[PDB]
Amino acid sequence: DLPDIQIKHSSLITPLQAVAQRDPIIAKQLFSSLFSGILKEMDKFKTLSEKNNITQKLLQDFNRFLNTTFSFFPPFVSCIQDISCQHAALLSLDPAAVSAGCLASLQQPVGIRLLEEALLRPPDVLRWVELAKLYRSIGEYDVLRGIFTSEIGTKQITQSALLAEARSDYSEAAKQYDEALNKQDWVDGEPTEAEKDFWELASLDCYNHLAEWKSLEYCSTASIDSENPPDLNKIWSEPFYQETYLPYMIRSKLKLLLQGEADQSLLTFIDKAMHGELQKAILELHYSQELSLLYLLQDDVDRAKYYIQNGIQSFMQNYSSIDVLLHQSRLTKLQSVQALTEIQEFISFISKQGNLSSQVPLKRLLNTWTNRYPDAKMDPMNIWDDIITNRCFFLSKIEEKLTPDISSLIRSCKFSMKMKMIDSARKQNNFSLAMKLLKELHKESKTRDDWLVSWVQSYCRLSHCRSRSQGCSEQVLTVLKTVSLLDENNVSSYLSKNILAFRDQNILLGTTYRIIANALSSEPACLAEIEEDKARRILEEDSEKVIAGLYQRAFQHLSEAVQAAEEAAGVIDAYMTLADFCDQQLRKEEENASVIDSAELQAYPALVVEKMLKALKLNSNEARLKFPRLLQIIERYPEETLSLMTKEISSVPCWQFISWISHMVALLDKDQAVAVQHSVEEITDNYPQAIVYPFIISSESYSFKDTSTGHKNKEFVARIKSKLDQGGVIQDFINALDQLSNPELLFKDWSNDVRAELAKTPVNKKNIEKMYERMYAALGDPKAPGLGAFRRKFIQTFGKEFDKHFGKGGSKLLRMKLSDFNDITNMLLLKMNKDSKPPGNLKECSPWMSDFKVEFLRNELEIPGQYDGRGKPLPEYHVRIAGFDERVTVMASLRRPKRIIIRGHDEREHPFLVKGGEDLRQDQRVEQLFQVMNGILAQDSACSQRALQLRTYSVVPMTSRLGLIEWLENTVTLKDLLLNTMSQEEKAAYLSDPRAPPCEYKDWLTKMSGKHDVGAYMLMYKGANRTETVTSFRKRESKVPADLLKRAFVRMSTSPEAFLALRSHFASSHALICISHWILGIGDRHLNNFMVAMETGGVIGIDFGHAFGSATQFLPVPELMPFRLTRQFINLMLPMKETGLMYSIMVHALRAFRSDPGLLTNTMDVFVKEPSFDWYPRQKICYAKRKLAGANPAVITCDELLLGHEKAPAFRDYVAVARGSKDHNIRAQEPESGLSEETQVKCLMDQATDPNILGRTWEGWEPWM
């Protein structure tokens, strides 16, 4: 009847053990918990000496375990390793054994955790090398930058080889590893044995990725012995040899036998290894597939059957024991399944006699194989090579046991599979392997025609791909070897009829010409200087006509490709590769003045618009992101080719523009507001909720001209206005949302307005009369709001209180005209606060939401923050406003916003935030810029593998001085997370102790500057020198706990791999928002402008009040840091530092951002088209362009500091601190601009982490934490 909680221990212990005896994962957790609890208990008694003896015995036991196991059972190895992680006396386990164990069982996260905990508490080069090995096995080349510094006593060449491996450039990597191993002098010292082993292992890995089986075989067998080495038992000796050379020796020899090698050496080794029982167990448990293929070579089909079925059993047993949240271990475990099952299919096909007598079964098999491939861009090339080599061997076997065009039939399949592998290799940037594979395939390419054209097309696009990395004068060479054969006839009945191949040929030719011309534009004649038989090729006068003709032929081929495509997504690429090329030409000519250039580029502006609108007709996001460029191309060409865009826009889906509505409705007051009217008008009726608010802000100020055709311009706006508001539900919703904002704040609004009109000088006409309406209407005579809207319950008390001074205000202050006395105004505002009762404390402060209670089909509110752009809106599923909560809580700011929490029709509860005092158009434009970024960010391959995406909330401006912001669920500010991660004692010490940094910083400023308040900074800059500030900052930050973030992430992680995932995601997200907030320069990144999603660990940026550089340009104390990279953030990444993951993430993001700077620059044009309340706009965009085309961050900081704090008491010291020391900071030792992505990030983080800066910043910024 009720739960019988009166339960035994046996009824809990017994089932616990019963499950533990059934599931290895539950057994692993049970053992870990029991062991940790026992070792915790034995701390009470059993004092130091005996317990140290116990832990030493345990450490020896675990070393034993890790060194003696041969079947690396993942739960067992992981249990041992995380038990070791949990106890400090047990950390120093065995870095070599830990590495081998957790790398042989795909348990790298726990080993990484263990080695990082051991590297905490003469650099430990061995542990660092093992950690690097573990990280490298995962990928994680981002982390392998803060590992291999010279300050861990390690050579430069391993760093260079690893960063060569970061790009799939294994040829250079192996070429440097073998150089390292064969370098004798070594005049810095002698590399440690661990680093030598790292070089050899990485060399074997490189020769694995690059399919040189001869080199891999040699390098794997050359270490054990020489003189035809006896890999008969030597590998089984020296247990180091079994996890290092045995896998590679077997793989190399097998993959080499599979392609025809007669050699009967591996077979003997395997035969005599099966005599033993340990060797047989190792060899069957871990390979079971090499054995299958080896015995298929010997035609021993039955042993292949046994070994492959054993291998499937092993896959199953090993996969089911990998823990569920250990992704990318289950992925790599799953990547072998296709090879396993294809060996199985080959055995089944070759066994059944119904096959290999006719040809239909072989044809079906070839078909299925040609339609079954490993994934491109995801499956690494070892998997591809396994699949393709296995299939080639199978086809060879079937061929030689097929007596009854079959040779051509299978050669076609082999050709297709190898071409597919080559495409995949090119996409993954294994250029060396792609080139090699193309080489030995360029013999059968010509024995057919389609094969020849496919081969040359693949070759030339491969050359284009590898062109990007090369600087110049070399990429022209590489792409030039393409046109010499890309011009082959190929019309011999094939390009004549085959449209797709013609299109591809044209696009590739145009891209080659574009590459050559851009390279020669970069270096004008430097490339042509080194040219002997190339001057003819570039020439087909010498300075600019060459480039003009190159662009001309590129445009010709590209337009040919578009027209060929016009007769899907095969046309989208052509449309966009024309639009971007022509627009690139347009921007190129934009920064120069000429007439013949106009006459030659006059064909482009219309062509770009029409092609890109055709792209938008199709579902394209890469074009939808290019939309605001289509509006600057009309404002620049309004006397021509404008009606063309009207024709194109007329037929484009209605919703395809919901993102850019604020762009459009900011144009319906200017002369070319046509070409938009159709789209906005059909939006207004098709989706009458995505247009309401943007149109309300826009129509609030058009200020038409009515000079030529203003009548229709008003008419369209007015018919839209009538089309909207669907009665008065939206308008009175807005009005009620206005009359809970503090009236005092609206009152200082009018105060600042009037103080800027009459009290300065009586020369302003009719503005006083224009404002006369509002101050009677709002916070004036209490009858006025009752006449206008729902009279708030305060304004009658206001009129009663504001009667003695308001009498003269409304009687004689209409023409007060004294303009020099405002003390009465100041005191009346001050006393407005004496009797002020700001909080509503409940929802009767606005009697329209409190009693909303939807009762009629009143065009339901449909809660804002929706219509995110992408896709058809489907307004049906959008949430409607069912009501409002009774309680509203007010956020502690001077502008004192309220966060209301409103109930949707789904009866769920949607928190929100109202602030009716600010124009949030800037916050809306910043958020849509973030949308643009994480759109272009989602196109770069590097930024896509890491899944780099900004997190954005919905900012919906109701009207000027009234906005609505979406409150994201279950996120907490960074400051609160840090605070509640602390203990009570340290919380009290940090908050309520004058030795704490909050009080120490103020006392420092006071004692050195003599000022107890603001302005002590202006003198402090002229005061304490760099050494003093740095010393004070070091001592100051040495007083807060140094692992708050680490503790917070441990406490919410419940696992080793989970902690790594959360920490890496936090660091990745934070570095992304750092670089993004720098590109468009956002300041005031204090500890509350960061939210942490307590469900994912991601970071969210908040409160873009200081959108572009304005915390350094319009503040008493300026901000000189680019973003927030402070002590806690670095300490999160120990034992690594902020030169690994964060640096690499910022470099990838910056490369994606500067690969096409046009997007952001074009997007930020609304700031000048419709400037907001908070010369001015053009300069901000110019700065954003300049720090996006490569520019030293300190230079831009100094420029903004010049523009804002010129002729300041300490301006020169400001710029001195900002620019750097030239002997301590890399940002001062670099050119002003023309700067690389990597060097720019170097300087950027140097500025971010600078005690000469951080030691002297605004106190509220909380620099120490």
Binding site: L2, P3, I5, Q6, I7, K8, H9
Partner: peptide, 8 residues
């Protein structure tokens, strides 16, 4: 001893 010691 059936140890929850109470009953809801």
């Amino acid at each position: 001893p059936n140890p929850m010691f109470e009953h809801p």
